[PDB]
Design a protein around this ligand. Structure first.
Ligand SMILES: *[C@@H]1O[C@H](CO)[C@@H](O[C@@H]2O[C@H](CO)[C@@H](O)[C@H](O)[C@H]2NC(C)=O)[C@H](O)[C@H]1NC(C)=O
Ligand SMILES: *[C@H]1O[C@H](CO)[C@@H](O)[C@H](O)[C@@H]1O
Length: 221
């Protein structure tokens, strides 16, 4: 179990819970057809009304930790339980207002992921563990400036040999992309992008040879 609960933007740490809708617990989302798949559920109130300014091309860290509290000292399951092999993914969706409560009907484009490297037997979850929960990626430099949600997700495939079984740990950050250009990428629906037939979601980690994370191809400029 893990929770995304804070951001760093071009090396500036914004603070615990700032600009993130933090779920109350590290319990997983398990239903890919639920609206909970979009941004999780049961947010800590009052939800942050900070919308982080991030230049297009900027480096963001989405910070995962074992619990909703963030860093609370040594913990062998922080940032995640390293037995829980699986991918890490990040998506953006353009939104009218990054503080708006309704997150349905948005169009999500993937900007980064890390799946599995067969030759090293290393998962994205392993890299996220090594890096202290710091899921680090750049915002595409060509994007249309304005308000976006930043959906960052750790999937545990430990029990994913059937569906349901995959455990989805995710939150949405609230950002305002500055600078940039005029690209408005094609996105996918949540729910909808993930299905029970996706081998990225139904996988036996002790039978894995090759692996492809679920959802669309990564967008690039
Ligand atoms: C993950 O990112 C965090 C947050 O930036 C790093 O913590 C900071 O480390 C810097 C550089 O040493 C310090 O100046 C900050 O005060 C730290 N921030 C906080 C909130 O404590 C952390 O080192 C990174 N972890 C790894 C493995 O890279
Ligand atoms: C944000 O910062 C990283 C270094 O942490 C760069 O690699 C990236 O290009 C962006 O400038």
């Amino acid at each position: 179990r893990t929770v995304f609960s804070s951001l760093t933007v071009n090396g500036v740490d914004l603070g615990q819970g700032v600009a993130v809708r933090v779920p109350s617990s590290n319990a997983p989302v398990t239903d890919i057809e639920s609206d909970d798949i979009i941004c999780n559920t049961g947010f800590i109130q009052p939800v942050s009304k900070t919308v982080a300014a991030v230049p297009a091309g900027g480096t963001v860290i989405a910070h995962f930790h074992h619990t909703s509290a963030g860093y609370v000292g040594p913990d062998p399951s922080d940032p995640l339980d390293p037995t829980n092999k699986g991918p890490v993914l990040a998506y953006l969706a353009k939104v009218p207002d990054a503080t708006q409560s309704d997150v349905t009907g948005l169009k999500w484009f993937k900007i980064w992921q890390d799946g599995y490297t067969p030759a090293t037997r290393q998962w994205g979850s392993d890299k996220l563990f090594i890096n202290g929960g710091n899921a680090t990626f750049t915002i595409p430099s060509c994007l249309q400036a304005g308000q976006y949600l930043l959906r960052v997700e750790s999937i545990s495939l430990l029990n994913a040999e059937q569906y349901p079984g995959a455990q989805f740990f995710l939150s949405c950050g609230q950002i305002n992309i500055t600078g940039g250009n005029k690209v408005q990428p094609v996105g996918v629906d949540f729910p909808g992008a993930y299905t029970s037939t996706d081998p990225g979601i139904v996988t036996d980690i002790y039978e894995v040879g090759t692996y492809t994370p679920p959802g669309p191809a990564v967008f690039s400029c």
